[PDB]
Write a protein that holds these residues in place. Structure first.
Motif, PDB file in Angstrom:
ATOM      1  N   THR E 296     -41.292  28.147  -0.063  1.00  0.00           N
ATOM      2  CA  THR E 296     -40.103  28.985  -0.112  1.00  0.00           C
ATOM      3  C   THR E 296     -39.967  29.746   1.205  1.00  0.00           C
ATOM      4  O   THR E 296     -40.958  29.982   1.896  1.00  0.00           O
ATOM      5  N   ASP E 297     -38.723  30.143   1.505  1.00  0.00           N
ATOM      6  CA  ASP E 297     -38.402  31.005   2.629  1.00  0.00           C
ATOM      7  C   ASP E 297     -39.240  32.288   2.575  1.00  0.00           C
ATOM      8  O   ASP E 297     -39.601  32.849   3.611  1.00  0.00           O
ATOM      9  N   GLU E 298     -39.550  32.756   1.363  1.00  0.00           N
ATOM     10  CA  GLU E 298     -40.289  33.991   1.188  1.00  0.00           C
ATOM     11  C   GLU E 298     -41.722  33.810   1.701  1.00  0.00           C
ATOM     12  O   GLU E 298     -42.258  34.674   2.406  1.00  0.00           O
ATOM     13  N   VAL E 299     -42.333  32.672   1.344  1.00  0.00           N
ATOM     14  CA  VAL E 299     -43.690  32.321   1.750  1.00  0.00           C
ATOM     15  C   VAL E 299     -43.735  32.013   3.255  1.00  0.00           C
ATOM     16  O   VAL E 299     -44.680  32.402   3.947  1.00  0.00           O
ATOM     17  N   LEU E 300     -42.716  31.282   3.735  1.00  0.00           N
ATOM     18  CA  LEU E 300     -42.566  30.944   5.141  1.00  0.00           C
ATOM     19  C   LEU E 300     -42.531  32.233   5.950  1.00  0.00           C
ATOM     20  O   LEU E 300     -43.191  32.334   6.981  1.00  0.00           O
ATOM     21  N   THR E 301     -41.813  33.230   5.416  1.00  0.00           N
ATOM     22  CA  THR E 301     -41.631  34.510   6.074  1.00  0.00           C
ATOM     23  C   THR E 301     -42.973  35.216   6.217  1.00  0.00           C
ATOM     24  O   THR E 301     -43.294  35.697   7.301  1.00  0.00           O
ATOM     25  N   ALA E 302     -43.767  35.252   5.141  1.00  0.00           N
ATOM     26  CA  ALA E 302     -44.987  36.044   5.144  1.00  0.00           C
ATOM     27  C   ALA E 302     -46.092  35.356   5.947  1.00  0.00           C
ATOM     28  O   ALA E 302     -46.982  36.022   6.485  1.00  0.00           O
ATOM     29  N   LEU E 303     -46.070  34.021   6.003  1.00  0.00           N
ATOM     30  CA  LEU E 303     -47.030  33.293   6.827  1.00  0.00           C
ATOM     31  C   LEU E 303     -46.831  33.660   8.296  1.00  0.00           C
ATOM     32  O   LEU E 303     -47.804  33.899   9.004  1.00  0.00           O
ATOM     33  N   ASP E 304     -45.557  33.738   8.717  1.00  0.00           N
ATOM     34  CA  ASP E 304     -45.172  34.121  10.065  1.00  0.00           C
ATOM     35  C   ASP E 304     -45.612  35.550  10.390  1.00  0.00           C
ATOM     36  O   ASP E 304     -45.989  35.810  11.529  1.00  0.00           O
ATOM     37  N   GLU E 305     -45.601  36.459   9.400  1.00  0.00           N
ATOM     38  CA  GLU E 305     -46.087  37.822   9.589  1.00  0.00           C
ATOM     39  C   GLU E 305     -47.576  37.813   9.898  1.00  0.00           C
ATOM     40  O   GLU E 305     -48.021  38.520  10.798  1.00  0.00           O
ATOM     41  N   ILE E 306     -48.341  37.039   9.113  1.00  0.00           N
ATOM     42  CA  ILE E 306     -49.792  37.007   9.251  1.00  0.00           C
ATOM     43  C   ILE E 306     -50.200  36.211  10.488  1.00  0.00           C
ATOM     44  O   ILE E 306     -51.228  36.522  11.098  1.00  0.00           O
TER      45      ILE E 306
END
Lengths: 319, 319, 320, 320, 319, 320
Positions: E296-306
């Motif tokens: 999901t875009d949500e998971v994609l987003t948080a991976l990019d944060e980490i």
């Protein structure tokens, strides 16, 4: 024996080219072999043949006779510059089956394979078009020849019976992609027929081709045809008188018409030398004397009077 | 038999191209051999096949039948211009395994090797793409074809079912590095379907390709399909009336619809000729008569009325 | 305003192209100027003209109207991607004197000098061939065009009314000697006439040309032609009226303007830079701006495609 | 008026070429101007001159007469495909000062500047070499000519009095670096002198040059020379008079003018664009126009060929 | 199975690339064969190996295990895109004998010959440099590769562990003379290490190379290395916390760290796909599920944060 | 003064590059002129400017200050290798009007004309791209630049803020058609920011570009920033201050100026032509001249490298 570079290339050739057209129809295998051995000992290293030589249903025979000559060893193949040809119909005379004559990549592939087999060698030194084929483009032709070059089956490419513009187009096409172009042209050139001087020999010289003259005695006519009692020229009294003036001039100076016809060609700018076709060892000795013969400016002058050349185009017909 | 150059190249071909698609599924080995012998005697030298011909789990069979024909000798391989194709899936019908269809260098390498084996020859004369593959670039394709050309395994490259821009891109890519480009395009072209005239035939003519028309009777429909009581056109009354006008016109002038469909194609600018697929010797004799048939300006005129062509782009849809 | 690159090149253009052929025959100088200023204000930077525009004895008039517009200053010339054209007879209507139409290097030279004079500018940004000339070779044409590039008189070269194969031949010839080829093709393309899809648009996409659609409403037929019966020949044919009727009816149901939809459709087609918006008044521009903000649903696109089927790419269009 | 493309290129020309060498030595300015206006009226757009025309101390005069013709305006310059030439000594008759004849880049530069000045024009359409210079390389020559193309001073390059192999070498060299090569060869070619057929005309056809025949009546010999005994050296030779006699006699039988037939013949030869019509009065032009409407029968062509046999193409001409 | 074109070329590949590095050292011949059969049945057609795989004095073994796999028939060789490598020292570890590593025409000639023998095939589909060699010029390298291409022994050339400028120089050199350049780059690319995004992947995309990511789990570290109690990252508490945040995020969403590491790479612009190296059939089934997994875009987003990426040069370090 | 060739080319330049961005915003005309005369006197021949320098509503001012400097005569223009730049928006700060930034042939044409006008010169020696434009193809860019070379308006072409792969693509494209490619790259490179080492500097060295380091003191941070607390964000971060502290401390021990060392370091890096010295007063120039006479010991280089580690070349930087 006099040697020269073949046009611009690194290959060194005798100024006499041994024609093999009599080997098979006129001269038998064994006599042909002896003539080729005598040629080597006189220093002639440049041998010309063709797939069609033999004629009739015996086309190929001349190539086979060279094949059997090489099979004797003694460095025969190694020391000869082997030239053959492609273009001619190798089936029965009359209309060829499509693509069984001329210069399609198809005809080149089948002709070279049969030639190599008959010659019992894995490579031809000089592979020559026998005539221009205006229906095949140069990107097709050079494709075919380059295949053979990269397989090690030919070294050099040459021409025969081309117009000057065909030499230019050929070599320009080749150079565009780094390929070695034509290295020689074989043209009909002799005292009686000098129209090669208009454009063929100028182009050849511009593009660094060797020039090889075939029919150097104009089919016998320059070999003392009156003294001994081609034929079509003897009936026309205009041309007859021309040869009569020729023979009379050569009696006076004490020279053989056979020999001067050849020596004259050896004086022309750009000419590598004539093709000599002996049927016997004694016809070969006579060609070798012609190669040694120096013609005087006086004789050169009078030959030009009797046998005027047309000059280069466009001066030959314009200004 | 009428002969012509294949586009701009040195290869001479009969104006009839012998299609082999019936050899295997419809015509047995022995009957196929006899038809090919009759073709040679009528002067047809240009034979078309494909790896997929045979169909189903029998793909390859047609190529094998030509293979066994060549194995009889009598100069059969030597006198034929052998054409085959690459692109089609040679496994079970349905979705191909990746790279087991289309025009990747991988598929070309495996397809040609299987084709050469089935045909029992060491070289194909004309190797044709069966369809455009827009996912493979021309530097990849020409790499593949040039490997084969330099190994002596193909002579010429052609196309089938291309757009005009694909012909241009192909040949321009080839010329850039001195390579001979496409020499022919095989397109669907007949009285009923003339959209090849918009861009395919203009491009082919500009780039010196031969144009070869497949489905020349539009799948039978132009072969007198009404008189004898493709199928989808007969249900649509608009197209039905078109063929009815066709058959009525040809009764009046006393001509066979089979034969004029072929002769009409032989009049079109740029067309080398039609592919004829006889299943019997008598279908072959009929194709040969169509090649001889002269159509009058009057008949040419009325065919154009019934079967109007779209003209070249952009005039066909703009000005 | 939506922007895009023109095909593969570095030039950015509005997805709406300002066509000027009504400037002169329909709309006078002063009114023409108002539209061009309104185009700038809406962020349209891409202005298309032709030498022949003006018509009849007034061919050249449109070019002159742009020239007088530029002469006012105010960053007008500097903001505009100026395109014009060569090919057309600029003399008396009828058969041209030889080399006074078509694409010889001779006609290219004379045509560009006259265009620069009428436009009162020292350079054209995009100089386009109005039609294909099959008798002029590409080494001739690229000679003429490269002279102009080197002197600074043009930057980019484009086409109009080419076949796909003409585009490939042009750009291959250019590229062989380093030259930048065609950057754009201007083709006839709308819901009613879709045959540019067969080969022209495929070729343009492959060579990275912008695709500019002219006659985007098919000469007014897709602009609500039936409702406004209160193009001429099309409405007379029963089968074609049927087609337009279904179009107008479908847009009634969805609450959409025929004029805006015909342009928005083009904005969805792959490789299409944009339509030629040719205004006679301020209304065509605003309508087009609304067209470009429209999102057509998949249901509307689906229905449009049933009514207005296309041929698809060749060879599949006529074979397989 | 019959038109054709000049060889492979986009330029359309009349099949009659207006030659101007009589303008100055024979025909004065005002009369020269009348002929050039009559040529336009007949639709002849292709005018051929040379720097050397004028003769002796008046070399340049013909160019000046065209210049004064153009200075009158009236679309004259714009309608005309203007051709002129370089190679010839423009100084005192006799051996030229070095580089003041022939085709060095030095002589090309000076010769073209003087030609543009005398012609009172900023560009030449077709700039032709008057003769082959075998001491000047093609990279030198194409350098000089490409400078001129890029500055806009010439469009097209042509030859005169070349060998076939010179044409191939020229155009191959040009094409290697993108340049447009020779577009035309002007060769001596008429019923009496047919050796251009051996290689010059074959080479031109292969490279897509127009072929322009000069001395189309063989210096007047094919223009009814015997009947008008009421070229000089030709009539003295018995065998050559015999040939002309048969010619004149055959045309008597068929009711045809020798002057028109010699030109109509050339119009039938493959690859021949057309003859140089060099008028001294209005009569040569009208005669040529009549020549171009003539259809010669196969019987007349056959008989002409028996009287005036040609060599055919080389190598067959001298070998097989 | 998801398929894609390998960069710009006509070759179609599975988005999973089967790495073979465990075949020999970890997985025995027989188990390796079964895994390759399971790969085919899952639709994986793209197999990667190297001459050095096997390691120690057992270098070559992996290639031999593929060799014996092909020798069983059943269309195994035919349906695989076979990739191997050249560059590595194939003698004893330590300083290589001169020209027994790196990319000299000498090393390429000897490496390919040994590879072909071990693989028991007459051609490699994709022959890849294992690393850039800055001491060998591209006219030398392309000479070597073109010899092989014209002999039919390789089809395509690729790279591994190049800088972006090396890809550009390579492909520009190739195109100059009409040669097909690199078709793919194999680079170290995963959540922890994203510097390939600066120039390697931008260049690859500009030049139409497929991008293949090796070490897709950063040597295990992204495969749930904390939950199960590479090693050097776990001692550094900065990086440890990074993986801890990773594992905690994936517990919450109910996803396997092994699988998302692979699915993440399948979302990156220009990435053909990851190399998966199963040691067992069950590790292969797990890779296939990762190929199906939508993030999901949500998971994609948080991976990019980490796991922030550096962006393209020059923006990554300038503006 | 130390000289070197600019990369592979025949042009000799001082290893110190005179940057002019303070001329206008910080230093006025007359003071700017004094610095440029002092640069000549110190033998600095390489002057770097940009169209955008001046800032805000005064973009262009720096170019104008050089123009007024040249207008004084005294061999100023003749002695100087004049470099300037294109890419940047020269309008109102904010999103540029289309084609009024970046590297389209359109923006190149307009940007160079305005630069030549402000500089009051007929030619620029080194015309540089200020940043990479990934939407503009190299055949477009080299077209625009070759027009300028042929007209004499520029001699050499350089880059700024490119990736390594952009340098290779540029120079390969140029060389394919004979053109001289990029001769220099201006990249951000100093002790603190060393990532140009990964691929930019390797690519430049391979294609024989000069490497010019801008922001050589990392915006003042390497110029004694801590001691002069009597760049802003850097000093706030604990770990980065730590790094600078060790730097300042190490130079205390060795008796060396931070300002000179940061430049001398760059002069040691392989393939580095030199740093941009951007003066606001006469002090920066003299400081830089002292930097260039400094010999840093291997012990100092070693220590600098421990404090300021670099990535090394890629692929090794991130892999092996």
């Amino acid at each position: 024996m006099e040697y020269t570079q073949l046009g611009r290339i690194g290959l060194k050739v005798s100024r006499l080219v041994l024609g093999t057209m009599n080997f098979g129809p006129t001269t038998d295998e064994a006599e042909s072999h002896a003539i080729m051995d005598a040629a080597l000992d006189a220093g002639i290293n440049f041998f010309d043949t063709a797939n069609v030589y033999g004629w009739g249903e015996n086309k190929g025979r001349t190539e086979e006779i060279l094949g059997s000559w090489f099979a004797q060893g003694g460095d025969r193949r190694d020391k000869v510059v082997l030239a053959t040809k492609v273009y001619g119909n190798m089936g029965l005379d009359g209309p060829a089956w499509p693509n069984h004559d001329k210069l399609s990549a198809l005809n080149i592939r089948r002709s070279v394979d049969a030639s190599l087999k008959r010659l019992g060698t894995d490579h031809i030194d000089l592979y020559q078009f026998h005539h221009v084929d205006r229906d095949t483009p140069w990107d097709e032709i050079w494709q075919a020849m380059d295949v053979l070059v990269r397989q090690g089956k030919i070294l050099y490419v040459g021409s025969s019976n081309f117009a000057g513009w065909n030499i230019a187009q050929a070599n320009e096409t080749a150079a565009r992609h780094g390929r070695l172009g034509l290295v020689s042209e074989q043209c009909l050139y002799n005292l009686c027929e000098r129209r090669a001087e208009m454009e063929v020999v100028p182009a050849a010289r511009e593009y660094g081709l060797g020039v090889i003259a075939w029919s150097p005695l104009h089919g016998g006519l320059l070999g003392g045809a009156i003294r001994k009692e081609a034929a079509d020229a003897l009936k026309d009294p205009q041309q007859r008188e021309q040869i009569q003036r020729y023979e009379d001039l050569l009696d006076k100076h004490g020279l053989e018409p056979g020999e001067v016809a050849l020596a004259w060609l050896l004086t022309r700018p750009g000419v590598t030398g004539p093709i000599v076709g002996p049927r016997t060892a004694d016809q070969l000795a006579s060609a070798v004397r012609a190669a040694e013969l120096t013609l005087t400016d006086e004789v050169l002058t009078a030959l030009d009077e009797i046998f005027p050349g047309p000059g280069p185009s466009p001066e030959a017909f314009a200004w």
